[PDB]
Design a protein around this ligand. Structure first.
Ligand SMILES: NC(=O)c1ccc[n+]([C@@H]2O[C@H](COP(=O)([O-])OP(=O)(O)OC[C@H]3O[C@@H](n4cnc5c(N)ncnc54)[C@H](OP(=O)(O)O)[C@@H]3O)[C@@H](O)[C@H]2O)c1
Ligand SMILES: NC(=O)c1ccc[n+]([C@@H]2O[C@H](COP(=O)([O-])OP(=O)(O)OC[C@H]3O[C@@H](n4cnc5c(N)ncnc54)[C@H](OP(=O)(O)O)[C@@H]3O)[C@@H](O)[C@H]2O)c1
Ligand SMILES: CO[C@]12C[C@@H]3C[C@H](C1)[C@@](CC(=O)N1CC(O)C1)(c1ccc(F)cc1)[C@@H](C3)C2
Ligand SMILES: CO[C@]12C[C@@H]3C[C@H](C1)[C@@](CC(=O)N1CC(O)C1)(c1ccc(F)cc1)[C@@H](C3)C2
Lengths: 280, 262
């Protein structure tokens, strides 16, 4: 270890993933007691990463930590709390960073509990969705950025197809997912001109076979679900490869149509329409 | 094809109407002979607007001053505006919290305030307005930006709030379609407009072609009156060519046969 040095990232490392890219990496996974988050903790553990998992339930988080250690995690810890509390979110990153002695990857995955319902007057669900699904991600990013700058790290943002296109019955949820794209795609452009070597990966997911999703869709929505294990891995890969966006859906037609080439062209056209020297 | 007659005698709310695009919309509506209720925080600028609206030919013109940071004011404002006009045909959501071009570092207060004013108040105003708009088979007009469709640096909080509007209003538009709620939703995607606020904020940063505020204000009204889902208004021909997302419309139509609704 003290007599060891070098790098895993060389020729083709921006295109071809290897589990060794995560060996010894310091990773935070939010909403990691169940679903996709837990699957990501498990994949990272198998890759020999140091992990700090979070969710509200300490009991479910203990089980994830124990299984992570069994799978071969370099180290595994949990810190339980609610992402409704901006003080907890801020404190959580400092404590997770202290446990690992730094941070390489921040995986933002938690959401507030949501169901399929038509919008009528539930402004409280709209506000809570914005607070938990979006604002806490911004707070976690602010708290994590100094450590990420030090490691030339990665931010992984778990979004949804409902964060790129419109679906009925998910108005509050969809607003919070669209907000993530607007926020994180803007700071990615800022990091580029400011030479902040921190990658940002927005993950656009279709229906995933998590217990929460399968229960919420039941009898309302009839779509093909994709497996949570492969989903979790595809998210990690995108983050390790520093890809701007990850798309994961069971339909081949979705993967074919989801990309927005015109958005990328437009953004390139505007890159020379603004003088930024004053901020850089 | 739009006709100014489409707005004659219509009951319209215009938010952030003390200046810029909002004031220009109030003026166009006044000339078309609509009943208008304008809002912003500045009493003295709203009074001037009301006066000029009356000189232009408005059926009636009123103002109610207050901050859209206050969700209670937003909710009560619609009830009082509706009482003044005896109903509501069009709700024009245009106000934003004061914003400047800056890199994002740690101003969570500006992120939260932008979400509250630019987005959450629009939802509160829509909830308060919907019973009257259902009665008139009315219209909701949402003023967004190109920063609400594509990424730009220095506007992270602002852009997140504009993207949130697209996600929220495009979802409820699908719900209104299947629920047979005859209330149209127009999302307006604007480029640089020659308002005093924008010209002052982009000074030394953006020179470019700034689209005139008067034509902008009319194009928003037209889209709303024509019940168009989206309005695009920019000075660049390349923008109008690339801004549309036909693949998004195709995907949404493909998923349309995946829901029950009953
Ligand atoms: N599954 C799908 O179909 C699907 C589709 C598209 C996108 N996605 C995205 O994928 C991510 C994971 O989804 P999932 O289906 O895996 O969810 P899930 O199985 O329901 O897990 C949600 C996680 O977040 C935690 N959580 C809930 N409320 C919280 C709060 N207030 N504060 C902190 N943590 C909280 C939960 O544990 P506690 O309750 O113990 O806190 C749990 O660990 C989400 O961002 C979701 O939007 C999922
Ligand atoms: N100008 C552009 O280049 C441009 C480009 C794209 C999109 N847009 C969109 O166009 C719309 C109008 O922009 P504009 O350029 O015309 O802006 P503007 O001239 O600065 O006017 C903003 C309006 O909002 C009001 N307002 C500000 N803070 C408020 C608060 N807390 N509560 C209630 N009202 C508040 C202002 O009045 P008070 O200060 O008196 O309250 C004013 O009437 C916005 O939605 C903006 O995003 C503009
Ligand atoms: C994790 O919790 C859930 C709770 C609700 C059901 C389900 C799981 C999901 C998944 C999701 O994000 N997408 C699949 C769509 O492809 C987008 C959904 C399901 C079908 C939709 F049409 C829209 C939204 C949202 C809303 C998030
Ligand atoms: C009304 O207040 C303003 C204050 C700030 C400057 C200016 C006017 C605007 C206008 C705007 O939304 N767009 C023009 C772009 O075409 C989108 C802007 C300017 C240059 C950008 F690169 C991005 C955003 C935002 C942010 C809104």
């Amino acid at each position: 270890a003290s007599m060891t040095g070098g790098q895993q990232m060389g020729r083709g490392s921006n295109e071809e993933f290897r589990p060794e890219m995560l060996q010894g990496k310091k990773v935070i996974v939010t909403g990691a007691s169940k679903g996709i988050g837990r699957e990501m903790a498990y994949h990272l553990a198998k890759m020999g990463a140091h992990v700090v998992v979070t969710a509200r339930s300490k009991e479910t988080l203990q089980k994830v930590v124990s299984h992570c250690l069994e799978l071969g995690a370099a180290s595994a810890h949990y810190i339980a709390g609610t992402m409704e509390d901006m003080t907890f979110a801020e404190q959580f990153v400092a404590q997770a960073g202290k446990l690992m002695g730094g941070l390489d990857m921040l995986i933002l995955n938690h959401i507030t509990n949501t169901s399929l319902n038509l919008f009528h007057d539930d402004i409280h669900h709209v506000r809570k969705s914005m607070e938990v699904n979006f604002l806490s991600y911004v707070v976690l990013t602010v708290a994590a950025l100094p450590m990420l700058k030090q490691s030339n790290g990665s931010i992984v943002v778990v979004s949804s197809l409902a964060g790129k296109v419109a679906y009925p019955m998910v108005a509050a949820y969809s607003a919070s997912k669209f907000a993530l794209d607007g926020f994180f795609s803007s700071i990615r452009k800022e990091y580029s001109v400011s030479r902040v070597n921190v990658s940002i990966t927005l993950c656009v997911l279709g229906l995933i076979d998590t217990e929460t999703a399968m229960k919420a869709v039941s009898g309302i929505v009839h779509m093909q679900a994709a497996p949570k294990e492969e989903c979790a891995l595809e998210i990690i890969k995108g983050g390790a490869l520093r890809q701007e966006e990850v798309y994961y859906d069971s339909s081949r037609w979705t993967t074919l149509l989801i990309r927005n080439p015109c958005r990328k062209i437009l953004e390139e056209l505007y890159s020379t329409s603004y003088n930024m020297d004053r901020f850089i």
